[PDB]
Write a protein that binds this ligand. Structure first.
Ligand SMILES: *[C@@H]1O[C@H](CO)[C@@H](O)[C@H](O)[C@H]1NC(C)=O
Ligand SMILES: *[C@@H]1O[C@H](CO)[C@@H](O)[C@H](O)[C@H]1NC(C)=O
Lengths: 97, 305, 97, 51, 48
């Protein structure tokens, strides 16, 4: 969609199959000199930067610290873990000791 | 494949809409694109002339080369102390390279390049919203002494870095009206200094040719219905909307764009430590900040307001 | 943020330039009739009024997109990986589950 | 004379280390023709009558 | 109180018995060069 996020897409930065719909329009030249007059919608990346809101490092519930490479949420409590432990018999001592 | 010899590349005359006389204009310095995506306010300016290179293209600091204002288009040197950059006040020039400049500028609304010579006072200007940019969560005019040293991204001052590549093609025809003269309703072709001239007239038929000598080729009626240009021009130029391509418009070379965004540690201000007064199920922060400072609060429960 | 590079326009004089489709990102080729090209130094071709100008406009990534780029991901499901410090009988154990 | 926008007009003569300058109040703002604001006139346009 | 009127007080202007309770905090020096880092509450006189 032009004028919005995702207007230009590619599988990688160094990829060659770049696809885009930037709503670019070519106009007939008016002055005698040479130029290519083009009217284009603004960058949807810039519009999304200007209207990003707040990221999840500042709005994630339960106090989850969002980290990247890899994408993960660290150090937050949201429930209960039932842990079953097989404690070895060498740890225990007899009641007489 | 990306060569940096610069002995096989040439600048060009650009069409930009504001010289000194405030009109659409031809300039040897034409700003093509401006990338203000740094974090120290430094900008990268793509000017249609080479920089740091001599007459023949050998690396020569404090000289630059451009296309002159004459029929014999000789690539002409000038000293780089005459170069000036401004947005609202003067800019500090930080780096120079062929087709590319790194300059630190105050905030403004238009980027201007100028040659401050005794006679040649050529200038050019593009529209660019150069704004005050800060990293972090507290605004600042300039970075302070005390800081946090967070990661930011800065244009590298060295010319050896590369942020990509730009395509360079061989130039096309570039016709002259000074190479055609109408005498007694007939056409003459006038080559200066005996240089070879390729001509094309179509008042009787698609009549091409090459001469270094004055010629009544078909006689014809007016010089306005024919052309004649130079042939000995195989010097690569970066493709621009103010030029005409040659018929084999394929990528003849690739040229490095300098001043890559290096990640760099850089300081940010530390705001005044808040005074927190505690009252039952709530707190009150007494916040003093000379500059705008971001406060972000969230509850650690299911609903993070 | 894109670059929207516009190359040098193609001119033919008393001749047509029906444009060829290309695989570049957001390609836009469009033909102009009745044009009179003019760079510095004079009118740039012979043909008086019947000229064709092929104007080309595709789009490309900016040179500084290797840093300021946004990557889009799908999130299906997330599983915990907790580090547990369990001590028992004056014996410690730090382990990830 | 063509001037940038400002709040005053100033004339000076840099003669004998004395400017002999004069300043007057004037509301000078960047005025534009037509219905689209512009810092400087562009290449492509409609060629509207102005004064 | 800091940040409001009466932050610095004295019986007379030339008196050496001057009292103040501005929130001035001395920070740990971080850079290599010698200085003092300090953050102060804004003077309450200009706020008044
Ligand atoms: C976009 O950025 C401008 C910069 O001044 C800001 O005023 C504006 O609120 C932002 N958002 C929108 C939706 O225009
Ligand atoms: C012009 O062309 C002739 C033959 O085509 C050649 O001998 C001569 O060197 C050329 N001169 C220039 C200046 O290119």
């Amino acid at each position: 969609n032009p004028g919005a996020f995702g207007d230009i897409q590619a599988s990688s930065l160094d990829a060659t199959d770049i696809v885009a719909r930037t709503d670019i329009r070519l106009l007939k030249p008016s002055v005698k000199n040479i130029h290519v007059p083009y009217t284009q919608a603004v960058s949807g990346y810039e519009m999304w930067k200007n209207n990003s809101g707040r990221p999840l490092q500042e709005t994630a519930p339960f106090g989850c610290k969002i980290e990247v490479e890899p994408l993960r949420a660290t150090n937050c409590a949201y429930g209960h873990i039932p842990i079953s432990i097989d404690i070895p018999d060498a740890a225990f001592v007899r009641s007489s000791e | 494949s990306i060569t940096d010899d610069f002995t096989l590349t040439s600048p060009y005359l650009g069409f930009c809409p504001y010289c000194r006389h405030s009109a659409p204009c031809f300039s040897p310095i034409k700003i093509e694109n401006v990338w203000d995506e740094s974090d120290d306010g430094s900008i990268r300016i793509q000017v249609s002339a080479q920089f740091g290179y001599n007459q023949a293209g050998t690396a020569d600091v404090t000289k630059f080369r451009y296309m002159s204002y004459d029929h014999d288009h000789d690539i002409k040197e000038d000293s780089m102390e005459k170069l000036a950059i401004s947005t609202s006040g003067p800019c500090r020039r930080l780096g120079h390279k062929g087709y590319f400049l790194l300059a630190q500028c105050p905030p403004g609304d238009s980027v201007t390049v100028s040659i401050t010579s005794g006679a040649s006072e050529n200038s050019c200007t593009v529209e660019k919203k150069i704004r005050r940019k800060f990293v972090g969560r507290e605004e600042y005019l300039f970075p302070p002494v005390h800081g946090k040293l967070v990661k930011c991204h800065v244009y590298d001052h060295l010319k050896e870095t590369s942020a990509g590549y730009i395509t360079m093609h061989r130039p096309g025809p570039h016709a002259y009206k000074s190479y055609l003269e109408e005498a007694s309703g007939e056409v003459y072709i006038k080559p200066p200094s005996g240089k070879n001239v390729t001509y094309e007239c179509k008042c009787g038929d698609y009549s091409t040719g090459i001469v270094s000598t004055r010629t009544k080729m078909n006689g014809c009626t007016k010089a306005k219905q024919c052309i004649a240009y130079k042939r000995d021009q195989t010097k690569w130029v970066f493709n621009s909307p103010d030029l005409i391509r040659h018929t084999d418009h394929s990528v003849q070379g690739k040229l490095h764009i300098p001043f890559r965004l290096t990640p760099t540690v850089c300081p940010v201000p530390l705001a005044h430590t808040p005074t927190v007064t505690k009252w039952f199920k709530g707190i009150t922060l007494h916040l003093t900040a000379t500059r705008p400072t971001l406060l972000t609060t969230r509850k650690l429960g299911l609903r993070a307001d | 943020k894109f670059h929207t590079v516009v190359p040098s326009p193609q001119v033919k004089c008393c001749g047509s330039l029906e444009c060829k489709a290309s695989s570049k990102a957001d390609y836009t080729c469009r033909v102009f009739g009745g044009v009179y090209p003019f760079m510095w130094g004079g009118a740039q071709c012979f043909c008086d009024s019947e000229n064709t100008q092929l104007s080309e406009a595709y789009v490309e990534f900016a040179p500084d997109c290797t840093i300021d780029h946004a990557v889009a991901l799908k999130v299906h499901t997330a599983a915990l990986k907790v580090g547990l410090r369990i001590v028992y009988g004056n014996t410690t154990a730090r382990l990830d589950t």
